[PDB]
Design a protein around this motif. Structure first.
Motif: not given
Ligand SMILES: *[C@@H]1O[C@H](CO)[C@@H](O[C@@H]2O[C@H](CO)[C@@H](O)[C@H](O)[C@H]2NC(C)=O)[C@H](O)[C@H]1NC(C)=O
Ligand SMILES: *[C@@H]1O[C@H](CO)[C@@H](O)[C@H](O)[C@H]1NC(C)=O
Ligand SMILES: *[C@@H]1O[C@H](CO)[C@@H](O)[C@H](O)[C@H]1NC(C)=O
Ligand SMILES: *[C@@H]1O[C@H](CO)[C@@H](O)[C@H](O)[C@H]1NC(C)=O
Ligand SMILES: *[C@@H]1O[C@H](CO)[C@@H](O)[C@H](O)[C@H]1NC(C)=O
Ligand SMILES: *[C@@H]1O[C@H](CO)[C@@H](O)[C@H](O)[C@H]1NC(C)=O
Ligand SMILES: *[C@@H]1O[C@H](CO)[C@@H](O)[C@H](O)[C@H]1NC(C)=O
Ligand SMILES: *[C@@H]1O[C@H](CO)[C@@H](O)[C@H](O)[C@H]1NC(C)=O
Ligand SMILES: *[C@@H]1O[C@H](CO)[C@@H](O)[C@H](O)[C@H]1NC(C)=O
Ligand SMILES: *[C@@H]1O[C@H](CO)[C@@H](O)[C@H](O)[C@H]1NC(C)=O
Ligand SMILES: *[C@@H]1O[C@H](CO)[C@@H](O)[C@H](O)[C@H]1NC(C)=O
Ligand SMILES: *[C@@H]1O[C@H](CO)[C@@H](O)[C@H](O)[C@H]1NC(C)=O
Ligand SMILES: *[C@@H]1O[C@H](CO)[C@@H](O)[C@H](O)[C@H]1NC(C)=O
Ligand SMILES: *[C@@H]1O[C@H](CO)[C@@H](O)[C@H](O)[C@H]1NC(C)=O
Ligand SMILES: *[C@@H]1O[C@H](CO)[C@@H](O)[C@H](O)[C@H]1NC(C)=O
Ligand SMILES: *[C@@H]1O[C@H](CO)[C@@H](O)[C@H](O)[C@H]1NC(C)=O
Lengths: 50, 189, 195, 241, 44, 145
Positions: F59-61, F65-66
């Motif tokens: 997932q983006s942040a 990134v995560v």
């Protein structure tokens, strides 16, 4: 002019300011017209001792 | 000082003449005759980008003005005091509004390609076909929806053997510096 | 270019270091000879000190930039040594570490201030659709494949390697039994062969 | 830590009979902000005498401004080489029959006008950022922090990839990894049911796949509530940001 | 890079000529910060 | 003033270069995580999650990134009596995969990471030599079909 070369290459370049230069000069002082008493600070009969 | 002067209202104290800011620059001054609180803005507009192809391709550029709204470009550049070769680059029919300010001098197309000159906020530019600079939303890649079902699989029947090339730097040049000869060679004093 | 710019990052810093010698740094001139020939000892010291401070700052800036670039180059060289140890000297199961696809071999070659790897890898080419089932209920007991999966072209079921189409008939040496055939979701009905 | 002496003997082993499926959150920085510096504005903006004196310092600003643009291009390269692993964007499948697995919080939803997932929305809300030219020009009676650094040549550049494009990239990667396994990372995407992919991965970790199906529904629950724990790890005053 | 009083590129030059019509051009002009005077002729 | 502000700018650029190097190292690590755990399955211990790594979901942040690393961990261990090999009739029997365990009376072959007891059959074992050099080998019978 900022990249210091006559041939720039393909890309996007940030640019230092050169485009606009001032033309006029503005001076604005308070509306006072009284000439200062330099005839009493200087050229007095007696000054004070040191 | 040097700058542009705008009428404003910063509510100076009665015994005050100028107002600073957090950079210790004259943010505003008081007119000594009309008792009016003026406002000083810097003349320069660092935050301008020039988007060009190579010099031996064309003498054509596009200008990106950053975080501005295109109607107030001529009052942010002060286009009245520029040469007309600048004044053609402040307004026109090639104005395209991006999320990174807006861009004058490159027409905007609805197509999407891989991009050569990255501008920002998804907008890229290129030099295409007469010849002109175009700006477009960058294409991430080919859209390809894969089929899927709970009882379907895909199995390869033939293969390919590929050779890929990977280049890695290992070392750089080794330099040594003589302080005396660099700073002042052959000087006892 | 990934090598070339490195050279262009080291031949340019020296050129800027040379071109910074023609800087006044606030002094009357950028030449030691002009100051030492135009001013006496007491008056030229304050100019030579400005030149010394400017050139020392320029040298320190060059050394700091070279240290940054040396750290980046050392990181790249550590990556290259890891790639030589784990792909040339062996075979890596790490995905996308050495080439795009399943890594088979790699050959190292030298380059000016660098290394280059020819990663030779295996990729699938021509995929084909198939109808698949997780298990086979032969006579009340589920059958799971040891390697590969069950596929069907429409009528018969075969075991297949997961990366190449090698259809083989269902035989009890290709499968193992585990429990009843009602707890598995999606199990189909067929018969296995026992030699 | 907790003191714990493990038993040991020459003819005793310990073997698990039940398992747990866990979801662990790992946060990695990818890029930093891209800034550009105009030396004339910072050192002495709008002053021809000091500009003339600054001309006698040489290439201390061409060298200064060359490093920051390399940093900006490096950050764009970092984001591109992290997220754009595959150039084929795979669309989200319309039907979520993944053997009982529920990829609702991680797949995007078209209803919310951001095209990002639920967990991505929580992560965007948890990170608090620390402007338009024209807000600074107006009468505001107190100069802003951003407006003071914009009038001194310290401009910040926007990233090349917006959040929408990065969310599209992550959505394509997630669709490829739930509809094709690992095959889309090596060549073309090869469709496979998700239960069979989990059988492949249990074979990878060292157990036979027969323990998957006989626990499959249970495994799905042990996945799904785990995703719910991520909500409890992000909405309830998280510190992992 | 040199700052100085230069003649800008494509600047507005004012132009006078001697053609016999029957006009000579010897007017009186402002000398502000130096001038650029370019003369083309045949017989000096 | 020029010297002071130039030194200030140089200091800022140097700190930015240091932080850019650190961020580039972190981004290289994140790209390696994306390639080796999202695009595949990694056998490296503790690279992606605590336990045996199954999958990873990206997932983006904001500027980052995560990863949701979904992994497999054992839950309820049980004690068993184990032996390295089985001497059936003078020849040792080593398991192909799994280990020999016993609940007290009978011996079973078991997978290394899950309790799946199976009867001793000659397709689960292979013979190697005689039962006098293995230390700790116990005596039992190996069934054959
Ligand atoms: C997947 O799990 C969620 C969490 O309980 C279920 O609930 C949905 O949660 C989302 C939030 O991301 C809401 O937008 C939906 O409205 C919720 N739906 C319902 C029915 O409560 C969701 O239903 C689950 N999906 C499936 C297919 O079972
Ligand atoms: C000083 O002032 C007197 C009048 O007070 C004047 O007569 C005289 O000329 C002045 N100047 C001198 C003494 O230099
Ligand atoms: C001073 O002069 C200005 C205009 O020259 C006039 O408007 C003002 O009233 C005057 N008096 C002041 C400022 O006291
Ligand atoms: C600024 O741009 C916005 C577009 O986001 C527009 O709606 C607005 O009218 C603009 N402001 C002007 C023209 O003053
Ligand atoms: C490009 O897209 C815009 C978006 O509304 C549209 O207004 C314009 O007509 C389009 N131009 C074309 C299709 O040439
Ligand atoms: C496999 O592909 C190669 C070329 O890529 C071709 O020469 C060969 O005939 C193919 N074999 C089959 C069985 O399709
Ligand atoms: C399998 O079938 C689907 C639909 O019939 C098709 O779209 C796809 O290209 C086929 N081949 C594959 C997945 O290799
Ligand atoms: C499927 O494979 C079998 C095995 O050879 C073959 O006999 C049959 O013709 C194939 N096609 C169909 C449609 O069953
Ligand atoms: C697979 O999905 C289809 C969807 O129409 C469904 O009809 C079928 O029963 C499913 N097969 C299973 C759950 O084994
Ligand atoms: C396979 O066997 C089971 C158990 O007898 C039966 O319920 C099922 O209907 C069979 N499959 C088919 C397609 O008849
Ligand atoms: C395994 O653990 C889960 C919860 O952790 C539980 O629901 C399940 O009943 C357990 N199964 C066995 C066989 O102990
Ligand atoms: C030059 O100045 C004259 C003065 O009236 C003006 O008419 C003319 O347009 C100017 N030339 C240009 C190119 O602006
Ligand atoms: C195994 O036996 C030891 C020795 O008493 C005991 O401490 C432990 O709790 C037992 N159970 C395990 C390891 O699950
Ligand atoms: C051990 O396992 C066997 C296998 O069926 C069982 O019969 C026995 O009751 C178990 N317990 C003991 C103490 O032997
Ligand atoms: C295991 O150790 C015990 C002593 O704690 C010993 O009596 C026994 O013989 C050992 N078992 C072997 C060596 O197989
Ligand atoms: C197993 O066989 C060996 C060799 O015949 C023998 O010495 C040993 O005592 C046997 N084990 C038991 C428990 O009797």
């Amino acid at each position: 002019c900022t990249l210091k070369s006559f041939t720039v290459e393909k890309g996007i370049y940030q640019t230092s300011n050169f485009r606009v230069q001032p033309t006029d000069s503005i001076v604005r002082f308070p509306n006072i017209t009284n000439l200062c008493p330099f005839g009493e600070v200087f050229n007095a009969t007696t000054f004070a001792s040191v | 000082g040097t700058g542009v002067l705008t009428e404003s209202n910063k509510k100076f104290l009665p015994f005050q003449q100028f107002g600073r800011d957090i950079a210790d620059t004259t943010d505003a001054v008081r007119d000594p005759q009309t008792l009016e609180i003026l406002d000083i803005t810097p003349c320069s507009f660092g935050g301008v980008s020039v988007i060009t192809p190579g010099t031996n391709a064309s003498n054509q550029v596009a200008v990106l003005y950053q975080d501005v709204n295109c109607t107030e470009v001529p009052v942010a550049i002060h286009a009245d005091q520029l040469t007309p070769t600048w004044r053609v680059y402040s307004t026109g029919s090639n104005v395209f509004q991006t999320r990174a300010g807006c861009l004058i001098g490159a027409e905007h197309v609805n197509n999407s390609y891989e991009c050569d000159i990255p501008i920002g906020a998804g907008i890229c530019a290129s030099y295409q076909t007469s010849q002109s600079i175009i700006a477009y939303t960058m294409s991430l890649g080919a859209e390809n929806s894969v089929a899927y079902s709970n009882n379907s699989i895909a199995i390869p029947t033939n293969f390919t053997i590929s050779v890929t090339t990977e280049i890695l730097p290992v070392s750089m040049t080794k330099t040594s510096v003589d302080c005396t000869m660099y700073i002042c060679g052959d000087s006892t004093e | 270019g990934k090598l070339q710019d490195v050279v262009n990052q080291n031949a340019q810093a020296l050129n800027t270091l040379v071109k910074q010698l023609s800087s006044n740094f606030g002094a009357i001139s950028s030449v030691l000879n002009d100051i030492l020939s135009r001013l006496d000892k007491v008056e030229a010291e304050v100019q030579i000190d400005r030149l010394i401070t400017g050139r020392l700052q320029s040298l320190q800036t060059y050394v700091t930039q070279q240290l940054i670039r040396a750290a980046e180059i050392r990181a790249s060289a550590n990556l290259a040594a890891t790639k030589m140890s784990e792909c040339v000297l062996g075979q890596s199961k790490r995905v996308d570490f050495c080439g795009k696809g399943y890594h088979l071999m790699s050959f190292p070659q030298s380059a000016p201030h660098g290394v280059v790897f020819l990663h030779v890898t295996y990729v699938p080419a021509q995929e084909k659709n198939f109808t698949t089932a997780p298990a086979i209920c032969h006579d009340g007991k589920a059958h799971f494949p040891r390697e590969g999966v069950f596929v069907s072209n429409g009528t018969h079921w075969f075991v297949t390697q997961r990366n190449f189409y090698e259809p083989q008939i269902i035989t009890t040496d290709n499968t193992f039994v585990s429990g009843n055939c009602d707890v598995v979701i999606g199990i189909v009905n067929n018969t296995v062969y026992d030699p | 830590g907790a003191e714990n002496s493990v038993a040991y003997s020459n003819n005793s082993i310990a073997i698990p009979t039940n398992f747990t499926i866990s979801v662990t959150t790992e946060i990695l920085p990818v890029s930093m902000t891209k800034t550009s510096v105009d030396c004339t504005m910072y050192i002495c903006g709008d002053s021809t005498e000091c500009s003339n004196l600054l001309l006698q310092y040489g290439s201390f600003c061409t060298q200064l401004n060359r490093a920051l643009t390399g940093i900006a291009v490096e950050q764009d390269k970092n984001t591109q080489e992290v997220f754009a692993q595959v150039k084929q964007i795979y669309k989200t499948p319309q039907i979520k029959d993944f053997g009982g697995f529920n990829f609702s919080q991680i797949l995007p939803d078209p209803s919310k006008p951001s095209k990002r997932s639920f967990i991505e929305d929580l992560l965007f809300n948890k990170v608090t950022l620390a402007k338009q030219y024209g807000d600074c020009l107006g009468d505001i009676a107190a100069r802003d922090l951003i407006c003071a650094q914009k009038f001194n040549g310290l401009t910040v550049l926007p990233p090349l990839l917006t959040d929408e494009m990065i969310a599209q990239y992550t959505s394509a990667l997630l669709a490829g990894t739930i509809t094709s396994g690992w095959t889309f990372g090596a060549g073309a995407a090869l469709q496979i049911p998700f239960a069979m992919q989990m059988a492949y991965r249990f074979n990878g970790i060292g157990v036979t796949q027969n323990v998957l199906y006989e626990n499959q529904k249970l495994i799905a629950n042990q996945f799904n509530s785990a995703i719910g724990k991520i909500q409890d790890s992000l909405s309830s005053t998280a510190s992992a940001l | 890079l040199s700052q100085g009083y230069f003649l800008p590129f494509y600047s507005n030059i004012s132009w006078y000529y001697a053609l016999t019509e029957k006009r000579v051009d010897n007017p009186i002009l402002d000398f502000k910060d130096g001038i650029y005077f370019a003369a083309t002729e045949k017989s000096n």
